[PDB]
């Protein structure tokens, strides 16, 4: 249905004479398409998908100048926040930034975001109306006032509802063979006895994309969620995802249990049981 673009930035101070570590990553939906890293030899924005390499030198020069401008801004913020919190010179500290936009299935703008964090905690975030900021603590009040006086929201809103949407439409069309696919889970079930009276049933989903899936167990047609074990969704490494859900069943009750799988690649929710 809807689609989204995200850029994720991380900057970490290294005490003494060392430069901060900086890393930037770009995604369309679940698919990564670009990177930058301060500790790489190339010092360029690099492609991470087959459909983006048709972009010319004018794209790769512009993107390289703009990740270096974010990189240079975070070096100054690391030194500033150390002071706002009255912290000592001895430890490393981390800044994280996420921004991007959501575009609907008809190509219209749905919403945009920006979020900042310092040492893993919320610092400041843009409100859903793209007009004002929410501060997390007393040091973030200084930044909120500074960014209001500078009208930072007005520049960022004009990117989020404008340029972010145009380039998302371009990527979705230019990669339509790969970004707009839907692969159903190649489901199966396995039986693993654990004792003379009990066995474990494991219900699997493999090879699916996008990563949004539900797995649930029922017994006699009643939900067993509180007694279910699940792994969190994991990448396969080839553009697909894996998940499983499992329950301990007393020996002889395997026919009373049933696993339900729900995903966009399935015309209706799919049921499995042991046989």
């Amino acid at each position: 249905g809807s689609h989204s673009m995200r850029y994720f930035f991380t900057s970490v101070s290294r005490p003494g004479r060392g430069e901060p570590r900086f890393i930037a990553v770009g995604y369309v939906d679940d698919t990564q398409f670009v990177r930058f890293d301060s500790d790489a030899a190339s010092q360029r924005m690099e492609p991470r998908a087959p459909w983006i390499e048709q972009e010319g030198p004018e794209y790769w020069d512009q993107e390289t100048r703009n990740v270096k401008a974010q990189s240079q801004t975070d070096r100054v913020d690391l030194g500033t926040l150390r002071g706002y919190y009255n912290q000592s010179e001895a430890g490393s500290h981390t800044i994280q930034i996420m921004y991007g936009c959501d575009v609907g299935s008809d190509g219209r703008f749905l919403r945009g975001y920006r979020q900042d964090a310092y040492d893993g905690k919320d610092y400041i975030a843009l409100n859903e109306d793209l007009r004002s900021w929410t501060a997390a603590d007393m040091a973030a009040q200084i930044t909120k006032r500074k960014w209001e006086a500078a009208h930072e929201a007005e520049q960022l809103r004009a990117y989020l509802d404008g340029t972010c949407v145009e380039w998302l439409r371009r990527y979705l069309e230019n990669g339509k063979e790969t970004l707009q696919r839907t692969d159903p889970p190649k489901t199966h079930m396995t039986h693993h006895p654990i004792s003379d009276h009990e066995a474990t049933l494991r219900c699997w989903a493999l090879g699916f994309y996008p990563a949004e899936i539900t797995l649930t167990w029922q017994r006699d047609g009643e939900d067993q969620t509180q007694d279910t074990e699940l792994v969190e969704t994991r990448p396969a490494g080839d553009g697909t995802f894996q998940k499983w859900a499992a329950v301990v069943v007393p020996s002889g009750e395997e026919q009373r249990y049933t696993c339900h799988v729900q995903h966009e690649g399935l015309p209706k929710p799919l049921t499995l049981r042991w046989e």
Partner: peptide, 10 residues
């Protein structure tokens, strides 16, 4: 595309 407008700091 990443934002191409330079911003003020914290």
């Amino acid at each position: 595309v990443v934002v191409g407008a330079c911003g003020v700091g914290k």
